[PDB]
Amino acid sequence: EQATVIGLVGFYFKDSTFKELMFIQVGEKSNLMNKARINTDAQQIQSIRWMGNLKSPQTGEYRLSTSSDENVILQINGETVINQASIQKNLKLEANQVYEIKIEYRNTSNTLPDLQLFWSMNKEQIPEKYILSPNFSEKANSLATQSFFPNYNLFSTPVDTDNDCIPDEWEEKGYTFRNQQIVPWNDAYSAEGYKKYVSNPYHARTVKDPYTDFEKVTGHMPAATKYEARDPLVAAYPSVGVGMEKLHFSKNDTVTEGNADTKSKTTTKTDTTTNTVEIGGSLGFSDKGFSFSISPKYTHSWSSSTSVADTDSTTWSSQIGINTAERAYLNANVRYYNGGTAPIYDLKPTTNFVFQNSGDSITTITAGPNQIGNSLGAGDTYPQKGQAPISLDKANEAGTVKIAINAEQLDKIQAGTEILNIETTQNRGQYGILDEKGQVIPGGEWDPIRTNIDAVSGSLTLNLGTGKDSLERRVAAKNMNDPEDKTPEITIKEAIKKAFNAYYYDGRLYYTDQGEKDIFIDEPSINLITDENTKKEIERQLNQMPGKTVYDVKWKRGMKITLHVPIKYYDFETSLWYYTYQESGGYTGKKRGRIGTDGHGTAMSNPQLKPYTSYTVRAYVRTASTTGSNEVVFYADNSSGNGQGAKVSGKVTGGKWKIAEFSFNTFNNPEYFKIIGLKNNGNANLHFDDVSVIEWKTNENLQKKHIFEKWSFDEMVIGATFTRVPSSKIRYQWKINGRLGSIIPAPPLDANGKRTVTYGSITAITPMELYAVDEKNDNLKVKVAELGESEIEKVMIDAHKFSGWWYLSENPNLYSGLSLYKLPDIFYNNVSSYKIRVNGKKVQTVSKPSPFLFQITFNLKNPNGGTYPTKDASVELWATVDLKVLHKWIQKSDVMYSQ
Ligand SMILES: [Ca+2]
Ligand SMILES: [Ca+2]
Ligand SMILES: [Ca+2]
């Protein structure tokens, strides 16, 4: 905390009559004019007004003197004290009481040498300690206080309607803040890094936040404020939230990490807006070159969703040994972040852990300035960056807290069907202000200031990475109901730029962070996400502008946009893709990959795809001639875009720049989408640039979670029984020997956790495959059970058991029939005939015997010649689908029957 800003603000005019402002030097403190010599314009000044406040140290009497009292008029509280050294005029001042200062200073010829300020109680020189800043909040929007730009001047003058001491014509035309002074902005300064500020010449607080435009653009704010918030247009505004790092869960109410019966799982905060985008159906080659994304559940980033990885081998309810009706105590480790731009002070957030889809609460905690800090800085975090995360019981003011859920919900959380959201309340806190000395002092409730800022601005969120701290920004916009507001109007690009303190690089906006891994955020490089209302306002605007990019639309009060960073991004511009030429051009950037008339470019090192995530791939294409019609394909395939994967067949190219986009769910086969690539085949060349790849949320591994057991099979049905299933609503679908049955819903588990899926119109056991179908999407299957012809072969062969032999009443050493048990009809209609060889002789073929209920029988008189078998014959039996079914020797030991 430097506090160099505290002091006399001074207005340096070039002429002798306070009329052509040149610069506004802040924070002068005793040796006047000296701080301002850093301006190359300083020795050309002939009139200077200072304004500020003087602290009177001890009670008593002071005589006030200067260097060139000849050319100084000095009022304090309006009363003239020096007037070209025509009075010595004594002043009785009280101790610890402050007084307004107005110094004017003029020389009809000669530049002014520096100016000095002197004490006395009987000389001396005024310590910088007792020289303070003009009270900015109350010289703001009042009358009959005295003005910063008064026309009289006391020996055509600037107007400043606000009294935030930024002239009207400056707030409109543009200014900046270079060398701790405010100067009118000329475009040179942009190459030095200076930003072009504009603001409202009629409100002192354009974006309605605690500091006047001047305090913001200068520095009269807390030191922990993001540089962003110096722009009159982006607000000082906090975003305190809390993400979860570890989730522990015990069988007993003593859920503390490091303990018997206390399992501990790791977790990661993820922005909820993006994790609730439902992919859609894919756009593939269309004009009006922009994509877009809508979230239903658009969530401000002070409200984290929590991600869990189901690496685990076994359900967590089994991991601790609790059953259906026993409860599972649990506890967690968390970290508080401030995604905002302003430090919040004396905070007290109460925080709600909820289920995403059935908005049920789990628990609540309230944290005090004793449990977390006195304050939370902008972009800071408690516990700090290198530190371990504090525990729920260490966070909650009221100590530990019983948190119990059942086995059902606890395994749904592992499986990811219940996402665990952490909404945390914004109302309690305090903004900082600069005092007399230059250290933060709590200055007021944040709650009314937040409602006022939100009223007058839009909402911009940079969600970089599913584990990294987001940025919550608010940028003012016009008041559309007022046909006279002078809040400056800016496009989306200008707002994104201002919101994130982003810089240019070949016209390419880009965001540089503290981990210094810079990111391109111009429209083709990121992925935008809005709610429903902003979609309409954007699309309403882009029907009236034929050069249509989202970044061009006028930025309107009440919008909500989220920037989402791609996971692979090919901007053809460096030192890449196979069979493609770098060349020179580009949608954005400098170069712009191209392929030929059969040209078949693919990607060197394309992205890492996950087993049940869904992705979006976007590209920018043109023809490289006028009209030269060619036919493109854009794919994410394992065979150049010929099945298993995702192609978009591009029937439309001629001339200008167009988007081409497709989305897919890698659904138990990420490998099917290994390679991104463009095939061209037509009249002209093919240009393209800015290929991007966007990641959208993993789902439950349907195949992994199914576990199989047994095959079931008078009763006329086939059924597949599962011990474990996934916890998601799914469907099933049979493949009966190539043909695919209707999609059917999941049957309900009964008793045990057993689900069994079945097939009805079955007459003879045939090879079958059971597919698990996605809940909503009919084209997302996965095999979960299969019945193959070598298994059926085994079932047929076992379904033939031996009932007994048939001897004769009339001679009981002669046998006459072999009988098996009747087969069940689902099996028997699968045999067509039998073959029987008795006494190794001729292999007779006989038709399917008609069961005489309880057992089928073949006779032996005739495959054995005419002799009723031999007491020791060999009987062999086949049944064709041929399949040896029994091979047996007639023994006196076996079951026998007679007639
Ligand atoms: Ca002003
Ligand atoms: Ca203003
Ligand atoms: Ca480029």
Author numbering: 10 to 131, 135 to 156, 160 to 170, 183 to 602, 605 to 742, 746 to 913, 917 to 934
Paper quotes:
In the current study we determined the crystal structure and mode of action (MOA) of the Vpb4Da2 protein (formerly known as Vip4Da2) from Bt, the first identified insecticidal Vpb4 protein with commercial level control against WCR. Amino acid sequence analysis designates Vpb4Da2 as a new β-PFP member of the Bacterial_exotoxin_B protein family (IPR035088) with Vpb4Da2 domain architecture composed of PA14 (PF07691) and Binary-toxB (PF03495) protein family (Pfam) domains. The Vpb4Da2 structure exhibits a six-domain architecture mainly comprised of antiparallel β-sheets organized into β-sandwich layers. Functional assessment of Vpb4Da2 suggests that domains 4–6 comprise the WCR receptor binding region and are key in conferring the observed insecticidal activity against WCR.
